[model samples]
Target chain A: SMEFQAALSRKVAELVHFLLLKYRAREPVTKAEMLGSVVGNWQYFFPVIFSKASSSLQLVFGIELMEVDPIGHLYIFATCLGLSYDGLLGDNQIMPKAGLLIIVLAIIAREGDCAPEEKIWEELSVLEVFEGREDSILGDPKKLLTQHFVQENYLEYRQVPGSDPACYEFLWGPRALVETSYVKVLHHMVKISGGPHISYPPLHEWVLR
Target chain B: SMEFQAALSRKVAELVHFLLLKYRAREPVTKAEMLGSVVGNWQYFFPVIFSKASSSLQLVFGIELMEVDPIGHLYIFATCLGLSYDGLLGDNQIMPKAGLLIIVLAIIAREGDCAPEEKIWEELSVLEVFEGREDSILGDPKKLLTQHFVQENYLEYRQVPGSDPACYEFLWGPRALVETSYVKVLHHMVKISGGPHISYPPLHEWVLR
Candidate 1:
């Protein structure tokens, strides 16, 4: 029963994306077409999918799904707010480069917000971007970190101030702070990594002042 | 000589993405911060970058960039049209396939609204998009373009009439005919022609009202 309920929810989510993707071209979508695509084999569950998807679309996307032609089962999307789907992210959020930036930010947040340069590379290298290799998508791991990310201030890279041997470090830069928060980044991290209860090195209660 | 200017324009464009990213957080972006971030090392060219970025940002993103705090050099994004960017997905392959689809439609529209399949591949192959190539963004480009778009009714792929060797052709489907106009596609075609001279194929206007 639980698995069936869970599976139904998953289909609902998929149909939500399907509706949004289909609605994007400013064309009417037919229920017959839906039954053919994402709803195939699940045709009996169309009522649940439509109801659940409509609510989710309304709540999160601020879109109202309207059945324009009852006879034809034709539907259209109407925005509740002035907000449009022209730039909003669905499923994946933000830019191509944001993936790298978010990972680095999560790594920094995971390591008490002042992640050591080597540690960053070590965790980052798990993406197979270490040992002087290039990620097909991110490309030239360290090169991007030291070049674009640092230069763009999504990351702060520098020699540890007055270190004994002048070691390097990476910090979440102001731009990173301004654009996204540690809470949001950590939430994204857990969700993306399958919601494992990732522990933080037990918090030390320091003076607020 | 001109290479450096082009490179400067590229940075300006990157800055536009950055500005939009920063604006999404709904915070006032200080020029000092931008100068420290994207405008770093190129501080001398800040004026040009700002002007170019502002123009491109306004024209494309439809966001009016305002220096709300001139004295403090703070900036924010203001929407001009009623449509606001909320669920508007950006960069990466979020909607990159739409570009390829538009190109396909343009090709269909350009070639008298009934283009041969071979002609489609011939134009697409020039962009290194071909059958079995598996593009990073579009992925199995032809597979989706032909099958998916056709199934969705944006495109119609069918066999030629009574041909001895059975050739196929593409046409704008009923859905496509209803959703988009010829004038709009042609305007986009000319703009996306990469600022180079492109010849109009011919005037068939057979489908035009």
Candidate 2:
């Protein structure tokens, strides 16, 4: 029934709102943590809605709920942060995985206020670093980091223009400079990687102004 | 900081539980309906969460919430339903888009109890049917729908042995026959595409005995 559909939409809205508030401080949500929190309360909602459906049906419903793409949602949020902050300076393309990787690479390569573009090595070097892991799913770093990223203007590419095919250089694109703080990217990366960091770089200097 | 993280996780879990309950009857969730329901409520959570962050941050947060991947999530749910019902018979490979198209194609092409395997033409016909839409991410439907699907046992393939590369044949995979109810699939597809006059073929006839 349309009524049922409308009710479900409202519930989804409330859920998204609640999750956004909960993670507003930029906390990572894990599958186990989510399941543990919800499983205990299953009895409350299970019978109320699915009185006619079989227990098997209810089990599938719960499992599907548990499988909601939290990681993808977080990536979307992170992309939004990248977009909203630096969008006026230049268009920041919404390539979530690529953008995150590029940002991390920028952070790692930064020297003072800028990072060297040459540090973004050819595809073989990246595949070597990723150790041919299927999960990496990155085919060509050169193409992703240079061709696409430069085209999207998330990066500023520089070189000796008149020197025929010359060396490549890089600087933060306007958006990257204004929106992406090296420290913020570093903080999230460390947290996600589960490193033993008691503290992050001071937030005041590197956060978006 | 850990306290903040824990609290956020709890909120997400509660939200998932609520949404699952609300859709216990398997309501199809669409993106527009979800955003329309949540945008008005942004003020409630915005100030409560990000008091010090720029007001622009609130706007982006609300926008990002609206952009949550409803389609992707629904695809995941559809996959789960495919999995839970027929998992014991054989593996159903997670092709995401490919699986959905194949299932819908199967539903549309069916006559009496089975869909024709010959209906899956070579890749060119598929691209034509999709009208070269960018959304059709599938490459080589012959490979995906036949080789991969057959390998994963979502489809049963046949050809006369020793007939010197005979023409191929297909039937319901053990999993598909034992798990998927044609009527159930049709009901969801129609509802999603927006139609009226409910009263599906009784579930018992098509559902796995």
Candidate 3:
């Protein structure tokens, strides 16, 4: 058992290298296309993200992405994000969890408030923020629209009311400064709607609008 | 050849119902034994959302969420929001794309904001005036404190500028929000978490806090 550990380690290193080269060598868009393979079928990421997900997401992705549904385009994007994490996690096992949490927090932070009976004017203000970041869709870091809204600007962010240092920490703390993913996976999303493989008026209209 | 359409309908229906239960049902959270299954893994929602993401932002969601590791339950929220449309989508085949577009437009109207980065105070004033509603988490609608953020808010809903009045009317028209579901599915989730196939510190910490 002791000797096997070293051999397993070597094999894992080789497997990691192979996966790294196989995934990283491809064009970023190509990698996204690979991701599109699972937009409407997120079960695909389970296999990669957890040791338990097995072949279910993988098999479903094969059928779903090629099936020509608009959801297929979305599936590709989900897959791209999942696969992009390969090899980047390095020695720290927690990096994957950290990356996952950032996205989840973004979702939570964005979902900060929802009152259906809320005034139409209030809804518009929220929409304005949503629309404000559309320019950043072109992979523009300068606008930082999505980033700004997700990381900051939400009311639910943990800011203590009476704690000046707490406020200062949340505002300027090192942890408050979120990590920027070099993966740049967003660009691949362009292909989801009116791209080379599929075309639809609804998708075309949505993207261009 | 025509029979293929039947399979498509069945598959789609199954997908729709499977997700509808997920959306309408109150997802469970519980504490349990060490060896027992813990429903703490939010990744379970991935397959559902990946199958039915409605907006480009959701496409971003799929990519972004999948990169997160499962140790953090936040990925579950990300995966579910991307697929949250499955609940609102219902079983009707007519105007399927219409429903998709309405949900998309409504989401865009809410989230696709346009504002300067420093305009938080200004945005808050507007937000205060017009209250926006949040989307519900597929698992637990009442468990507001849980990580299900995207499910609860559709705060930013925008009308296409100068679009056809009828189409716009169709977009803004009354929605068929279904209320009935197999609530047991959610109950099972709660049972699993409390029973403990796994132990999660952050989720439990959040619960305690």
Best by lDDT: 1
Docking class of 3: incorrect
List model 3 lDDT by residue over B28-121, tens digit each.
2111211122124423443443344323223222211232344432222233323243321111111111122222333323333322211322
Residue A148, candidate 1: C-alpha displacement in angstroms: 33
List the candidate 2 regions with Cα displacement exceeding 4 Å: A1-95, A98-109, A112-117, A122-124, A127-142, A160-165, A194-209, B1-209
Best by DockQ: 1
Span of ten consecutive residues with least summed lDDT in model 3 chain A: A87-96
List candidate 3 segments past 4 Å from native.
A27-158, A168-209, B1-209
Q: RMSD of candidate 2 to the true fold?
A: 29.2
Given candidate 2, what's the lDDT at residue A79?
Answer: 35
Clashes of each: 7, 0, 58
Question: True-contact fraction for model 3?
Answer: 0.00
RMSD of model 1 against the true structure: 18.1
Global Cα RMSD, each model: 18.1, 29.2, 27.2
- Predicted candidate 3, C-alpha RMSD: 27.2
Candidates 1 and 2, the one with greater lDDT: 1
| Order of models, best lDDT first | 1, 2, 3
The per-model lDDT (C-alpha) reads 0.62, 0.38, 0.28
